[PDB]
Design a protein around this nucleic acid. Structure first.
Lengths: 373, 156, 275, 153, 314
DNA sequence: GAACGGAACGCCTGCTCTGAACCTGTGCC
DNA sequence: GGCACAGGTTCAGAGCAGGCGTTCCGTTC
């Protein structure tokens, strides 16, 4: 390994190319010593044609290579890449790469590979443009893989000049009845720490999908949130429920409707998880004056069924706050506010009615009947 | 119906050239028959229809006849010259109609005018382009038309 | 410094040499003009000089009609039959393109606000002086490359800018009542001097017709097809928006302007010789 | 985790230096939640009453306020028939006024403050908030009878 | 009838709970806006809040029109008095924060705001926009949705600015006529300056803009006047914007110089002489920053065999 | 009064403008 | 006759502007 590393100081100029051939001879003959060979070939003096040859002679045996060595391998591929050898290597690269195959040390170097690919594609627009032009030219096959998704999210997360072009390509791809559940399930179940890296870009893309028409687009804007919430840690869960509460308090009805359905989905899904952030679901009651009775029936239903998950009756806190704000809104003179109360009251009565619970609904329906007489 | 016509190629048979030239002349006589109704039926909505669909039909003639005409000219010249001089007689009535939407300073009419005039002058100079492609650009004559009312007067 | 005495006696000297001497070296003639223009632009707007040049062109190259006697050597001596044709034609036109862009951003900004009265007056003086320019080139018998086609395309822009001026006076006159005598005079002058000479010149070039890769040949002629249609379109929308002004300011400016000159084609008996 | 580090100073601080008329100990029934006793505010109808409260500490406490109810029945404008408290520092910003500059004692002090001074502008009970205001003695009679049947011994 | 000037805010608080029509809200808000001149600075913020909880159920255009024209006027007062900041800037910041928090609950206002602040034709921008409205926009940048539109908006707003300039020098004609109206060049610079009173919502958009400019109109023409000069003058702004956010904002200048070399290094597909001369004046003022940012400098030597002679040399 | 034909704002695309290179005419030794 | 400047021309490609689609409102019988 050291001799290899020292060969550039040793050899005279007549005997570069010679050594070149017989090093490619050693390359096929032993894998372990891929790295220093490569480093050597790139610190030799050679003819570029030969370097194309050996680079293909990398690429063919790239399934056989232990992962640890891949980064500097693929760094080499993407410094040996020309402007003209772009799609060639990238299509081949994009095919041969697996990232299903590799999987505790595996996951760490996968992450470090992605760091290295980030730095590559971050660092030459040459790749980004052509990379995309190579994923759009895979709109043909329904079968384009986890890498193509994760890679898109990545170029949107890093590369800025392209943001419209990624969104354009993703929208013309997603409408077409390409990327669907099955892809996202596998992506977010396997590559979840690579994606917890890029938390921003995920939720940035989910928000940009909620603002379009076409239930297919907005369905994906939903699902992107869904999988981030299901899978990611408590930090990113809080940030997820954050963007949805931003839509409810803030947006126009489409956004509001969407986000309400999503919270409704996530709570029947995992009551316990939303329980942590259920304070931010109550934080919508600030701006009840910006939201319509339809949406109010659904909101009081979602909060009320969160509370009437049976195991979370230790955390009656939200339930008692809502009971409180009910009697408060009922006890307003103004018909607009009494109406909000009445809706919430009857929804809550209904969900908790599915002997003390009988007395509870009795009291609530009697007091709404009495305020409303 | 006329916009669903495809222009052919020079490689395509003379039979299909003549059947499409026949189908074009059927549409150009149906168009002159429809235009000739204007004089006896002068009203707001009927003028709005013909100013509008005049130029919209002129455009079907610009896209799906004029490519068939550069192919089938050295073979079927007389057919095509007849088809074009048939359109010229109602061409002149659309120029006179443009006269009427000007003199009756009528805004509802004068909307589709600037495009009518431009779309018509496109078809004039597209004929010059046809003669250029058939190597006789020296044969394109042009000359002005007498400003009539719809019926045929000399409004002066 | 543009207003320095030494700048002004420099501009004066340049003008004098351009006005006296001939010099049949081409780019030399071009250059003492380019100088003179770049000197003049910083001192005052350049329409007086453009009208003088269009009048020398009218004198030198003749006319469409084949029977008008004109000769106006006296204005600028570095303008020849040899010079002026692909030379001082281009120069005078390019200086108008700019002058018209100056005036059109002015109008654009005036329409923003809703100070005004001196703004419209100077706009109109410019437009009227360079109309004496456009009229004197439109009379002339001009060579038929982009020399004529640049004039055509700039006469499109002439009318566009007037269409916009019109649409601004629509915003004013509906509220108050005006179209001051300078604007009525302008629309009359566009009818009497320019619009019918458009139709005389369009027909003069169109009729005027004096080895070719098929695609490039079609691209050449389908480039040449657009500018005459869009001159018709531009004048039609001028006249059209003069209708809207006529109705909603209670003065028919359609009294000054004529009914639209309309065209029918022919094909002659030469097709039978060639095919 | 933070729950432990707050509760550690607080349990210890409520055994060693609780506020006047107030105690709070780790409940003998419930060795996770806190039992308080707030003794009826002086010159209020709650005089001679010992008012039991359950203080529920949330999980992300001290980022969330404590969750307190009157377990002794209380006849009060800002307290309903189930012991629910109209309190700003029981909710988070902007509706409420909890933040980490506060603690279980400062709020239990603010609770004895509300027992003495009901707020008629946050009524849970409109009958009692009205009675408190318009027939003070009928409120004070009913709340003192309340204190004799439920807060007595 | 005239309203009690001490209690105009307080009377406006009663209208909040009663229902009004469109003409009713128009009249209540336009009198409350007539009242802005004849009052002290620091009661304006809660009054603006009181106007806006009303404006959400009717007239919203009027609110922003008024606030913006009013503070434009008052900012003009400061500038011509300079030819009174340490109260003005604080109240301005608080008002910008209030209207951003309102846009956070009513995105429509957002959209009506942008529509109001449109360039459109080149004359409208010259009376629409201000050092305050820019301040406002670059603050709105904070909310994910309008980042894009706002930045494009400012961006083209910016170029127009230069087209206006260039044109007006060239000829004698236009100079006469037009009185030289504030260019969005000088307006934004004053915005950067007055973030010192430390409005730190603002700054992210300023960095964002300065870079975008250096991105879009880099010399790739050089690897006339019309395609060269108004596209020198976009990044030469970019440069001054980022030079001043670095020389004023001490917190930021880590991400600023991170993002500069991000673009200097692995690129050299499109040239970067303008970035090099930014980098130069960044580090020359205060190299001391560079010692927290060595991480990038260690991985710049990484690729210091694939970068060409002139990137590396400098 | 009511039925018809024109005005209003968000989306897509064709037209235009540009600039860069190659090539074919033509100018001079 | 041969070579090189000149200008024509031809194409990539960026960016702009207007006409349509879905929806409301003035006008004429």
């Amino acid at each position: 390994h050291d001799i290899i590393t020292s060969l550039p100081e040793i050899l005279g100029d007549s005997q570069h190319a010679d050594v070149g051939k017989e090093l490619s001879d050693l390359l096929i003959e032993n894998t372990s010593l891929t790295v220093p060979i490569l480093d050597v070939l790139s610190s030799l003096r050679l003819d570029p044609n030969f370097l194309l040859k050996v680079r293909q002679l990398v690429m063919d045996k790239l399934s056989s290579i232990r992962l640890e060595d891949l980064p500097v391998i693929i760094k080499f591929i993407l410094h040996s890449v020309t402007a003209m050898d772009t799609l060639e290597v990238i299509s081949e690269l994009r095919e041969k790469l697996d990232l299903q195959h590799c999987v505790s040390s595996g996951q760490s170097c996968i992450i470090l590979l992605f760091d290295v690919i980030k730095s590559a594609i971050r660092y030459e627009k040459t790749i980004s443009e052509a990379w995309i032009k190579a994923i759009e030219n895979t709109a043909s096959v329904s079968e384009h893989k986890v890498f193509d998704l994760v890679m898109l999210f990545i170029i949107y997360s890093t590369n800025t000049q392209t943001k419209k072009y990624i969104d354009r390509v993703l929208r013309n791809k997603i409408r077409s009845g390409c990327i669907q559940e099955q892809l996202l399930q596998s992506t977010f179940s396997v590559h979840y720490l690579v994606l917890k890296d890029m938390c921003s870009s995920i939720l940035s893309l989910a928000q940009s999908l909620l603002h379009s028409l076409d239930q297919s687009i907005i369905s994906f804007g939903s699902l992107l949130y869904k999988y981030a919430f299901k899978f990611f840690d408590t930090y990113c869960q809080q940030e997820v429920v954050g963007a949805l509460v931003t839509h409810i308090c803030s947006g126009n009805e489409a956004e509001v409707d969407t986000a309400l359905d999503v919270l409704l989905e996530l709570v029947v899904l995992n009551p316990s998880a939303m329980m942590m952030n259920a304070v931010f679901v109550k934080g919508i009651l600030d701006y009840l004056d910006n939201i319509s009775p339809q949406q109010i029936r659904k909101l009081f239903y979602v909060l009320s069924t969160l509370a009437f998950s049976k195991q979370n009756e230790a955390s009656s806190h939200i339930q008692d706050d809502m009971h409180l704000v009910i009697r408060k809104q009922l006890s307003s003179t103004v018909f607009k506010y009494k109406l909000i109360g009445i809706i919430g009251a009857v929804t809550m009565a209904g969900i908790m009615a599915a002997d003390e619970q009988c007395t509870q609904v009795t009291s609530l329906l009697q007091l709404v009947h009495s305020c409303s007489e | 119906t006329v916009k669903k016509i495809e222009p052919g190629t020079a490689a395509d048979s003379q039979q299909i050239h003549e059947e499409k030239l026949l189908y074009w002349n059927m549409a150009v006589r149906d168009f002159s028959i429809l235009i000739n109704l204007i004089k006896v039926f002068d009203s707001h909505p009927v003028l709005h229809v013909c100013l509008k669909y005049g130029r919209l039909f002129v455009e079907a003639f610009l896209k799906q006849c004029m490519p068939l005409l550069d192919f089938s000219f050295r073979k079927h010249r007389e057919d095509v010259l007849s088809l074009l001089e048939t359109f010229q007689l109602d061409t002149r009535l659309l120029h006179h109609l443009c006269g009427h939407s000007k003199i009756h300073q009528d805004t509802r009419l004068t909307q589709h005018v600037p495009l009518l005039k431009k779309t018509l002058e496109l078809l004039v100079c597209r004929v010059k382009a046809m003669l250029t492609l058939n190597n006789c650009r020296e044969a394109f004559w042009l000359g002005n038309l007498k400003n009539r009312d719809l019926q045929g007067e000399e409004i002066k | 410094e543009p207003s320095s005495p030494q700048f002004v006696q420099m501009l004066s000297w340049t003008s004098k040499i351009c006005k006296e001497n001939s010099r049949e070296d081409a780019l030399f003639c071009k250059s003492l003009m380019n100088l003179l223009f770049s000197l003049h632009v910083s001192y005052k707007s350049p329409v007086i000089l453009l009208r003088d040049l269009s009048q020398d062109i009218h004198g030198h190259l003749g006319d469409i009609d084949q029977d008008v006697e004109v000769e106006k050597t006296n204005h600028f001596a570095i303008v020849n039959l040899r010079t002026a044709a692909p030379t001082v034609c281009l120069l005078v036109l390019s200086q108008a393109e700019k002058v018209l862009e100056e005036v059109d951003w002015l109008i654009t900004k005036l329409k923003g606000q809703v100070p005004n009265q001196p703004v419209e007056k100077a706009i109109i003086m410019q437009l009227g002086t360079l109309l004496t320019f456009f009229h004197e080139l439109v009379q002339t018998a001009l060579p038929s490359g982009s020399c004529v086609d640049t004039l055509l395309k700039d006469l499109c822009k002439m009318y566009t800018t007037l269409t916009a001026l019109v649409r601004y006076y629509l915003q004013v006159c509906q509220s108050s009542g005006g179209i001051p005598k300078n604007m009525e005079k302008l629309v009359k002058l566009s009818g009497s001097h320019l619009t019918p000479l458009c139709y005389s010149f369009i027909s003069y070039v169109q009729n005027k017709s004096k080895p070719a890769v098929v695609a490039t040949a079609m691209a050449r002629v389908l480039r040449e097809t657009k500018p005459i249609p869009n001159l018709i379109f531009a004048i039609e929308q001028y006249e059209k928006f003069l209708i809207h002004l006529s109705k909603k300011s209670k003065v028919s400016l359609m009294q000054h302007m004529k009914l639209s000159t309309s065209r029918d084609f022919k094909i002659k008996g030469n097709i039978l010789d060639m095919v | 985790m933070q729950r432990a580090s707050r509760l550690k100073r607080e349990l210890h601080m409520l055994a060693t230096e609780p506020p006047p008329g107030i105690t709070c100990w780790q409940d003998k029934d419930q060795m996770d939640d806190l039992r308080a006793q707030i003794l009826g505010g002086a010159n209020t109808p709650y005089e001679k009453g010992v008012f039991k409260l359950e203080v529920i500490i949330p999980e992300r406490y001290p980022f969330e306020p404590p969750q307190i109810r009157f377990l002794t029945p209380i006849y009060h404008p800002n307290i309903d028939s189930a012991g629910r408290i109209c309190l700003d520092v029981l909710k988070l910003p902007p509706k409420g006024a909890w933040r980490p500059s506060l603690n279980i004692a400062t709020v239990l002090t603010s609770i004895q403050l509300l027992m003495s001074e009901p707020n008629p502008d946050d009524p849970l009970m409109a009958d009692i908030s009205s009675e408190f205001k318009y027939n003070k003695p009928a409120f004070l009679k009913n709340a003192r009878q309340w204190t004799e049947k439920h807060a007595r011994q | 009838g005239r309203w009690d000037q001490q209690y105009v805010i307080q009377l406006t608080s009663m209208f909040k709970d009663v229902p009004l029509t469109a003409e009713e809200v128009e009249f209540v808000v336009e009198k409350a806006l007539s009242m802005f001149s004849k009052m002290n600075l620091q009661e304006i913020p809660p009054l603006v809040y009181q106007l806006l909880v009303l404006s959400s159920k009717g007239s919203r255009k009027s609110v922003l029109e008024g606030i913006i024209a009013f503070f434009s006027a008052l900012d003009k007062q400061h500038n011509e008095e300079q030819s009174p900041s340490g109260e003005l800037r604080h109240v301005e910041g608080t008002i910008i924060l209030h209207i951003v928090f309102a846009i956070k609950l009513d995105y429509e206002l957002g959209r009506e705001l942008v529509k109001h602040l449109k360039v459109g034709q080149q004359g409208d921008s010259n009376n629409n926009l201000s050092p305050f409205s820019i301040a406002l926009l670059l603050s709105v940048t904070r909310i994910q949705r309008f980042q894009d539109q706002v930045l494009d908006l400012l961006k083209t707003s910016v170029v127009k600015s230069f087209k206006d300039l260039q044109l007006l020098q060239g000829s004698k004609f236009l100079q006469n006529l037009v009185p030289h109206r504030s260019y969005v060049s000088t307006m934004i610079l004053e915005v950067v300056k007055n973030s010192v009173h430390s409005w730190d919502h603002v700054t992210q958009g300023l960095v964002e803009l300065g870079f975008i400019l250096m991105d879009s109109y880099g010399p790739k023409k050089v690897l006339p006047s019309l395609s060269r000069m108004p596209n020198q003058h976009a990044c030469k702004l970019g440069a001054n914007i980022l030079l001043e956010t670095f020389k004023i904002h001490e917190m930021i200048r880590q991400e600023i110089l991170e993002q500069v070399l991000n673009r200097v290094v692995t690129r050299a597909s499109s040239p970067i002489s303008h970035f090099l001369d930014l980098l130069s004046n960044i580090v020359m003022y205060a190299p001391l920053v560079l010692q927290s940012c060595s991480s990038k400098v260690t991985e710049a030597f990484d690729y210091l065999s694939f970068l060409p002679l002139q990137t590396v040399q400098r």
